[PDB]
Write a protein that binds this ligand. Sequence first.
Ligand code: ADP
Ligand code: BEF
Ligand code: MG
Ligand code: ZN
Ligand code: ZN
Ligand code: ZN
Lengths: 65, 106, 43, 694
Amino acid sequence: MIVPVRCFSCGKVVGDKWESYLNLLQEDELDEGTALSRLGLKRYCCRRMILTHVDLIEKFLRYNP
Amino acid sequence: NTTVLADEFIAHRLGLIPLQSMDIEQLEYSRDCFCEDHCDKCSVVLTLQAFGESESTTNVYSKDLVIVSNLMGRNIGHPIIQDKEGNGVLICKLRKGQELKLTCVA
Amino acid sequence: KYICAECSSKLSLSRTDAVRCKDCGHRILLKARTKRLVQFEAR
Amino acid sequence: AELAKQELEHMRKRLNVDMNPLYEIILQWDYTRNSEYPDDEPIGNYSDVKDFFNSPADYQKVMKPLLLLESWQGLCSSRDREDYKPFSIIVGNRTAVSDFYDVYASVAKQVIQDCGISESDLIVMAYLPDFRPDKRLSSDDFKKAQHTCLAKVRTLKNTKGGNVDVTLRIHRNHSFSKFLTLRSEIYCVKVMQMTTIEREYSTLEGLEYYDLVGQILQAKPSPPVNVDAAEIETVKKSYKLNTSQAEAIVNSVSKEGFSLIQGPPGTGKTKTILGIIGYFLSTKQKILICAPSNAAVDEICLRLKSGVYDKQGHQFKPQLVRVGRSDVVNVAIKDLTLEELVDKRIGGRDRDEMREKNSVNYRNRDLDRRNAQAHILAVSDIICSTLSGSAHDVLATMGIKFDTVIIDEACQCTELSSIIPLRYGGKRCIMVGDPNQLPPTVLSGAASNFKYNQSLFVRMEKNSSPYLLDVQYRMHPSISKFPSSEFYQGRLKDGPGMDILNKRPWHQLEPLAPYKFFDIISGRQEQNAKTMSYTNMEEIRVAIELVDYLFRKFDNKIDFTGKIGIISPYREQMQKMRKEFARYFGGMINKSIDFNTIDGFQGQEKEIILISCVRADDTKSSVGFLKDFRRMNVALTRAKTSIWVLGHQRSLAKSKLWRDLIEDAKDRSCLAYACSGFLDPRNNRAQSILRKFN
RNA sequence: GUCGUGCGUGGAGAGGGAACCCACU
Ligand SMILES: Nc1ncnc2c1ncn2[C@@H]1O[C@H](COP(=O)(O)OP(=O)(O)O)[C@@H](O)[C@H]1O
Ligand code: BEF
Ligand SMILES: [Mg+2]
Ligand SMILES: [Zn+2]
Ligand SMILES: [Zn+2]
Ligand SMILES: [Zn+2]
């Protein structure tokens, strides 16, 4: 549903940059790796945590409830 | 609570939310001090309220949390904000017909 | 005591009463969460 | 079936419009900012009002920046000119709603009553840790303070112990939210009321669903529909009108869509509206009349109270409802007020039981009042109000549809104001107004530069020629000599016997003439520090002396009840005039005399008019907004028999228009010199001053 | 550079199978 609050591997907080990540992907039309590097993600654990996440919360909210 | 998410899910997400702990040494464990009902001397109490209004689903962030307990001038328990936008850690999303009202004790 | 799936409006119906929504013909008739205090832990 | 469902959907969408974007945009503004624009965005974003709009989206895009600029300018004016009473509140729990934060605070009932805080008000909140409780608190402290946040009063709920739970909605991104700690004192002061702005924004958003959206965007009135001359002659005979007015009425009624009637003052424009209403009623249908100024609505209601004639000539009195509050509505038509009609229609354990019974009784009374109001609205055929008041929440909740809309003085309101009453499924709209009158009251010069001040009536007239009226029946021909020759360059013919019917006994006296100009030899005006409004007591004294002399000469010979009016451009000057008149004469001024402003007195009719020129000081070297020809035209077109202009010759002579007016008055020997007690033989000082000046 | 404007609420006890379709060791 929502981006994980902390990385499973290390525990770094990556949920703050999810909106920033989406903005960089859309507003700046930057590639995944460049955007993640700009956000300040060195270890690939957070890279795959952010890249591999799927926003099912938006899909769920599409329904009337 | 009437969000699409689950109470346990949102509670787990809130648990991972960082909180200021500069004065953690001053704070004492609840199991240590002889208290009742999570006295503020050993715990920090916050309240979360959120609900959309007919449109523009509301996004819940760390900044939404407001401390209700008396910290006695201690800068402990304040939400940690580091993103450039300053919104904080995304928590959940509430639809127009979804209501969220909860209390958190750290 | 009860809510409609679509209308999401309270009904507060009693025993020996129709279980159909008064506003609409839908009769899912969901029930709201209990008023009793509930606590959860991140663990 | 499907068509009815679509119509109902459109009606509910127009009535129910999301206000979140408006609050989000406005609250982001900085109260402490001192500028002519809400933000530092490029000026290129703002664009002039296009004559032709390709689609509703383009119209909304063009209008939104102008509306935001006007709202910001109004907020700044309220911050500077208006000074409310600041109060203090205690911060409570904060709720995160869509792109907003709602804060609940506890306030004292007496403080709320004194400050007049309602559920549709805007306030500015600040945190002042160093503020001294003993030290006075005013808007100056808020201006000096750098931590200011805009808030909207969502709701006001009264709790036990005389405590009101005020809900304040603010923007999340605003940093001041960090100061909103629980149990913290925050100093909040009201700024302005957003009801009109909210209604304008709702109308702008809902214009897409309006039936006449295409005509408004294209600004193309429906083509005239030919009608037999027999009907025109019959209408003229029944209503005792002229050929032009009858033709205009027939053309407007025959054709659907927008119908524009352009008639200078005194050309029966109000009488034309009454004739249209009567013809429509004779031919259930409910008609909505909207006038930008409450004075125009009051005049229309008073005229309708006398009865409406049908085609056969019989006079009938339909039920007329005035949508407004008693205070603003005139006392004469106070009976026609909707609230008055509703009032006429209806008008331990033991303590707990008594409280429950009292609550039940109050609920029953509220239900009875609502039922009476609904019955009055449904049965009523004519609904007269203002453009801002035409979107009253009660009307939206009721859902009644008005197929006929009339907009009086369409040139005095902006496009949004004129379109507000069209939200109720307006299929036929008749706009009556004269372009030479005053433009809409816009507080922003930049907005006027972008043609925001331009009214929908002006644009429609530019697109196509409205129905023109060139015959007058109110203004005295001598009084209309200069306004017609200069402002209209002719095209305005006096009535066959206007001079004969305008003869009055006081016209014989040399001091009082149908047209006369009085010069204040010694007169100065002081500008208020806060309101920045000029005011001079010399003109007030001269007017009081003139009124006293007129009453003494003709106390019982002629009654002056509702026949003497004084128009002053400045609100402060008008208030001072009214106060001094009440002090001198007493209660008679409440009825025998009226006081108003040129813009607020537009459309009014009075036998005797006194036009006060506040700018009586030559050292100023500026005439102000009076320099515009529309202001002078409106001021001069109020008098029916007698017009008396008070001012300083030297100060006014600087401007070309006033110089020409003074020259014309001198040519007709209407110039006069006035001062303190110039009509008192005992006061030889005034006579000596007059002799020296001559 | 000062102009309009919207609203009146007190102890106690206690019975269900046969078949079909999948999956794991
Ligand atoms: N055919 C007519 N015969 C006599 N009087 C008329 C006729 N038509 C109009 N009038 C007079 O002209 C006046 C028109 O006033 P009006 O132009 O409506 O004022 P305003 O321009 O301020 O609205 C009315 O008071 C009415 O008495
Ligand atoms: F044209 Be009038 F002055 F209303
Ligand atoms: Mg008129
Ligand atoms: Zn990681
Ligand atoms: Zn404790
Ligand atoms: Zn239902």
